[PDB]
Amino acid sequence: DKATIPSESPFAAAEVADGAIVVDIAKMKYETPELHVKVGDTVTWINREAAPHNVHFVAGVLGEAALKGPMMKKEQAYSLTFTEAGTYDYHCTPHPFMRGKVVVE
Ligand SMILES: [Cu+2]
Structure with a gap:
């Protein structure tokens, strides 16, 4: 696989990890629809x-x-x-008009 899953189910916003790269879902959109990470x-x-x-x-x-x-x-x-x-x-899934991408490079 090209990604691992720390937690199979969701967790609270306050429990975000140090150094995590956050994408907010707000206004019915992925607020960063194209994210570049390492x-x-x-x-x-x-x-x-x-x-x-x-x-x-x-x-x-x-x-x-x-x-x-x-x-x-x-x-x-x-x-x-x-x-x-x-x-x-x-x-x-329920709202397929919401589209995003992660570029890893
Ligand atoms: Cu949605």
Whole structure:
């Protein structure tokens, strides 16, 4: 795989790790829709809205399987630690008009 998952389920926004690269989900959008990080960085999405959101990478992007992240409730967070260079597109499962990408380089 090209990312590891610290926590399979969401955790509180206040529990964000030191050094994590935060993407806010606000105004119905990934507020940083194209993020550039280095190998080994942890990206943490934080849902700021009442509507639940996730991140969803189709099969063949982060690895063989799709990575369908857990639904984050308001003020919950979810992390992926990227371990390989590449370009990784994702969307929100219930709201597929929400699109983002992580470029690892
Ligand atoms: Cu959504």
